[PDB]
Design a protein around this ligand. Structure first.
Ligand SMILES: CO[C@@H](C[C@@H]1OC(=O)C[C@@H](O)C[C@H](O)CC(=O)[C@H](C)[C@H](OC)c2coc(n2)-c2coc(n2)-c2coc(n2)/C=C/CC[C@H]1C)[C@@H](C)CCC(=O)[C@H](C)[C@@H](C/C=C/N(C)CO)OC
Ligand SMILES: Nc1ncnc2c1ncn2[C@@H]1O[C@H](COP(=O)(O)OP(=O)(O)OP(=O)(O)O)[C@@H](O)[C@H]1O
Ligand SMILES: OC[C@H]1O[C@@](CO)(O[C@H]2O[C@H](CO)[C@@H](O)[C@H](O)[C@H]2O)[C@@H](O)[C@@H]1O
Ligand SMILES: [Ca+2]
Length: 360
């Protein structure tokens, strides 16, 4: 038998088969209803007759009726499998409410009739995909950012930090900046154009002030992008002002510490005797960690916060848009993991609360 791995994010579903090197299906975590439903790309295509909703909000499932539709679409339309034939590994956000873990479990067993299931913490899987069982993950997607310190294979929940700022906020900030300059981006469709601009042209400045001065004094940082309507937008300092928000959340009116500060704060909540190992094993995960320059910037910023002699290493895998999924693919493949699945037999005996005993 082959296990399935489903990694449900705020913006994108990543799904596939355990042992594969990448998710076979990657599509928007969007459900559209009329007035029975459409999912993902098809929903965006018919946005004019549908109300488009994201069932996961800052990494937490909030619309359960729509979430069930995403799962159904994943199994039957994208993967084209019979879920009753496959153990299924799902993922969850750090600090996911217990009730939600139970609900995921109930749905998978009673609606989809999976033979076995497990729910793993996303950041933990990313660490595994880097070949590590100890380290600190910065996981930043479309909806939420977490710092998750992990020791001997398990997250340290009391030291987890959360920032409700991630890729969609960065897209929205870029939309705002560009709209102010006279290129109106407001609709959901226009958001997808600006998302593309962000992904292609933005980067993290090593020294934000220095970069601002460079952009003020030359055209060396300008890049152009042709819109669907044929307008050519040129941006310079917007390229690095947009992701600077991760380090300076006040750019969008948030009072939160930036991601370097949250990384440091998380390390300082951990056992003093493991901090050295965390500093030497900072792993970046998620689409919002893809900006050029981000690892060098984080290296600089953590170096300024940490003790002077501390060895600091930032690991930024090329495949890190999919590190969570890949870590799942690895885990669900292992012989040592097969006794860890929750079986339907165990579920039929114990009910949804078995998830708390079997999954952490
Ligand atoms: C970090 O150790 C992992 C296991 C070893 O795998 C690795 O080290 C992964 C590296 O090889 C990745 C590399 O650095 C980069 C990579 O290899 C790349 C990312 C590469 O890109 C092309 C890639 C993409 O997909 C894959 N590789 C892929 C998919 O399947 C596999 N690889 C695969 C399936 O089986 C294996 N590999 C087995 C590998 C042997 C080593 C494992 C014992 C890890 C999953 C082990 C986890 C544990 O032991 C847990 C503590 C224990 C209990 C569970 C605890 N929790 C769930 C806690 O929350 O698990 C049973
Ligand atoms: N090259 C890139 N540069 C900047 N951002 C990128 C890049 N590639 C993808 N992104 C952003 O990454 C986000 C998607 O990342 P990912 O799939 O990790 O998030 P998710 O799992 O859907 O959300 P979350 O983990 O927040 O629930 C989107 O905001 C997307 O625009
Ligand atoms: O600087 C970080 C990172 O951004 C990239 C573009 O992705 O380069 C930008 O920044 C450089 C430093 O100012 C500029 O020289 C370059 O022209 C600009 O695009 C990456 O090359 C770099 O790693
Ligand atoms: Ca995610």
């Amino acid at each position: 038998t082959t296990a399935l791995v489903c990694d449900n994010g705020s913006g994108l579903v990543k799904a596939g088969f355990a042992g594969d090197d990448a998710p076979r299906a990657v599509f928007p975590s969007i459900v559209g209803r009329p007035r029975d439903s459409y999912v993902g790309d098809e929903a965006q295509s018919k946005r004019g007759i549908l109300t488009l909703k994201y069932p996961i909000e800052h990494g937490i499932i909030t619309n359960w009726d729509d979430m069930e539709k995403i799962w159904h679409h994943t199994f039957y339309n994208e993967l084209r499998v019979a879920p009753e034939e496959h153990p299924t590994l799902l993922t969850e956000a750090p600090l996911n409410p217990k009730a939600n873990r139970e609900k995921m479990t109930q749905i998978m067993f009673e609606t989809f009739n999976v033979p076995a299931m497990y729910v793993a913490i996303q950041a933990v899987l990313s660490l595994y995909a880097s070949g590590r069982t100890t380290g600190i993950v910065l996981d930043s997607g479309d909806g939420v950012t977490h710092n998750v310190p992990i020791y001997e294979g398990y997250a340290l929940p009391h030291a987890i930090m959360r920032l409700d700022l991630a890729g969609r906020d960065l897209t929205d900030y870029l939309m705002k900046i560009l709209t102010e300059r006279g290129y109106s981006f407001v609709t959901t469709a226009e958001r997808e154009i600006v998302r593309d601009i962000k992904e292609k042209l933005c980067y993290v400045a090593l020294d934000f002030e220095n970069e601002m001065a460079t952009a003020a004094s030359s055209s060396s940082l300008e890049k152009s992008y042709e819109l669907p309507d044929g307008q050519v937008i040129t941006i310079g300092n917007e390229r690095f002002r947009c992701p600077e928000t991760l380090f300076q959340p006040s750019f969008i009116g948030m009072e939160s510490a930036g991601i370097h500060e949250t990384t440091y704060n998380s390390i300082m909540k951990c056992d003093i005797d493991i901090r050295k190992d965390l500093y030497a094993n900072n792993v970046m995960s998620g689409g919002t960690t893809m900006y050029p320059g981000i690892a060098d910037r984080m290296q600089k910023e953590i170096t300024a916060l940490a003790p002077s002699t501390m060895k600091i290493k930032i690991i930024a895998p090329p495949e890190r848009k999919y590190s969570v999924w890949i870590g799942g693919s690895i885990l669900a493949s292992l012989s040592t993991f097969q006794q860890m699945w929750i079986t339907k037999q165990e579920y039929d005996e114990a009910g949804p609360s078995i998830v708390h005993r079997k999954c952490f």
